[PDB]
Amino acid sequence: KLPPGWEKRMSRXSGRVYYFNHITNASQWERPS
Ligand SMILES: [Cl-]
Ligand SMILES: [Cl-]
Ligand SMILES: [Cl-]
Ligand SMILES: [Cl-]
Q1: 6-10 contact pairs (CB < 8 A, 24+)
Q2: Rounded to the nearest whole angstrom, what is the distance from the C-alpha of residue 20 to the centroid of ligand 2?
Q3: Domain residue ranges of the chain, discontinuous segments joined by +
Q4: Which helix (H) or strand (E) element contains residue 7?
Q5: Reading across the β-sheet that carries 17-21, which strands appear in turn?
Q6: How many CA atoms lie within 13 A of 29 on its CB side?
Q7: DSSP conformational letter for 30
Q8: Residue 33 class from Cβ within 10 Å (0-12 exposed, 13-18 middle, 19+ buried)?
Q9: Which residues of 14-26 are buried (b: 16+ CB within 10 A; e: fewer)?
Q10: Which ligand is the nearest neighbour of the Cα of 10?
Q11: Tell me, which fold does domain 1-33 have in CATH?
Q12: Distance 9 CA to ligand 2 centre (A)
């Protein structure tokens, strides 16, 4: 699936899903490869 660190999160501002990297703090809409 996602490289290390990447996970999906629901925005706390109306629930849109983004990809977040807990290692690097990166975030993006598109799926990381
Ligand atoms: Cl992880
Ligand atoms: Cl979440
Ligand atoms: Cl959030
Ligand atoms: Cl949202």
Answers
A1: 6/32
A2: 10
A3: 1-33
A4: strand 6-10
A5: 6-10, 17-21, 27-28
A6: 2
A7: S
A8: exposed
A9: eeeeebbbeeeee
A10: 2
A11: Ubiquitin Ligase Nedd4; Chain: W; (2.20.70)
A12: 4
- Resolution reading in Å: 2.0
Written as one letter, the residue type at 21 is N
Nearest ligand, CA 12: 3
Amino acid residing at 25: N
The token pair at 21 is: 């990297």
- Both tokens of 19, joined, read 């990809």
The residues facing 10 across adjacent strands are 17
Task: Output the six-digit token pair for 32.
Answer: 């990381």
